[PDB]
Design a protein around this ligand. Structure first.
Ligand code: PBM
Ligand SMILES: [Cl-]
Ligand SMILES: [Cl-]
Length: 76
């Protein structure tokens, strides 16, 4: 569920996938953070144990809200 995002990420390099599924390739964490920032989105570590770790560009708050919404609705 919970993913670490943005500056919480410690990986030197990550494989980057953008908000639409475009495979941006291997990028330094710094460049990945720049791309996320220019798009006003978050850099989310979706696959911490992949080699190299996989990050997805997305709005973390919107993603998390929808996930919690889904869980709650299906149980009431
Ligand atoms: C990967 Pb830079 C500090 C424009
Ligand atoms: Cl640079
Ligand atoms: Cl943000």
């Amino acid at each position: 569920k919970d993913f670490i995002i943005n500056e919480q990420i410690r990986a030197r390099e990550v494989r980057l996938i953008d908000q639409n599924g475009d495979q941006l390739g291997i990028k330094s964490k710094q460049e990945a953070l720049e791309i996320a920032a220019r798009r006003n989105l978050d850099l989310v570590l979706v696959a911490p144990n992949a080699k190299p770790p996989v990050c997805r560009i997305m709005d973390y708050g919107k993603f998390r809200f929808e996930q919690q919404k889904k869980e709650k609705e299906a149980r009431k």
